Design an enzyme around this catalytic site. Structure first.
Site, short mmCIF file in Angstrom:
data_model
loop_
_atom_site.label_atom_id
_atom_site.label_comp_id
_atom_site.label_asym_id
_atom_site.label_seq_id
_atom_site.Cartn_x
_atom_site.Cartn_y
_atom_site.Cartn_z
N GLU A 67 16.02 28.37 49.41
CA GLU A 67 17.00 27.37 49.84
C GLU A 67 17.57 27.62 51.23
OE1 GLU A 67 16.78 25.05 46.22
OE2 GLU A 67 17.46 24.70 48.27
N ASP A 108 19.09 17.81 52.76
CA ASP A 108 18.06 18.61 52.10
C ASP A 108 16.72 17.91 52.34
OD1 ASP A 108 18.48 17.66 48.53
OD2 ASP A 108 17.86 16.48 50.25
#
Ligand SMILES: [Cl-]
Ligand SMILES: [Cl-]
Length: 162
Positions: free
Chosen positions: A11, A20
């Protein structure tokens, strides 16, 4: 290696609101804030999550706190879910982290939808499960990350993360 270091690799860490891989406002270590296109709505989610009026910017300590909650949420999502819990119970510690990783990325409902892959994992048909996992929107949209998680299911080792 462990689930936290693993998800930290996958991440990244960013202290200001970013988008994202799907274009959704996110912050910290992969913490999804909202699917709304409103940056204001995302900032409201952030203030609520952290408990203070943020400037769209958090500290590392705050990013790690949301991370701890989110890992815990993923595990408890698995354990509450009637399709995910038996698979989790059936796996070794490394492959369990691979399942937590998928739930962290896609949510409990999404992973519980991988019905056929789940059965192959519970059956311990690792190569077959690895092929079946790759036949997914998940694989096509994030192929390098999916390859790492799939290699973890296939081998039961951390080789993809070293
Ligand atoms: Cl939250
Ligand atoms: Cl990727």
């Amino acid at each position: 290696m462990n689930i936290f270091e693993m998800l930290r690799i996958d991440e990244g860490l960013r202290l200001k609101i970013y988008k994202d891989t799907e274009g959704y406002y996110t912050i910290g270590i992969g913490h999804l804030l909202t699917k709304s296109p409103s940056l204001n709505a995302a900032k409201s989610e952030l203030d609520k999550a952290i408990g203070r009026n943020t400037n769209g910017v958090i500290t590392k300590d705050e990013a790690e706190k949301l991370f701890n909650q989110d890992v815990d949420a993923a595990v408890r999502g698995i354990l509450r879910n009637a399709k995910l819990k038996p698979v989790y119970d059936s796996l070794d510690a490394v492959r369990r982290a691979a399942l937590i990783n998928m739930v962290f990325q896609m949510g409990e409902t999404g992973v519980a939808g991988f019905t056929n892959s789940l059965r192959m994992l519970q059956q311990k048909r690792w190569d077959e499960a690895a092929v079946n996992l790759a036949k997914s929107r998940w694989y096509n949209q994030t192929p390098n990350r999916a390859k790492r998680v799939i290699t973890t299911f296939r081998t039961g080792t951390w080789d993809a993360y070293k």
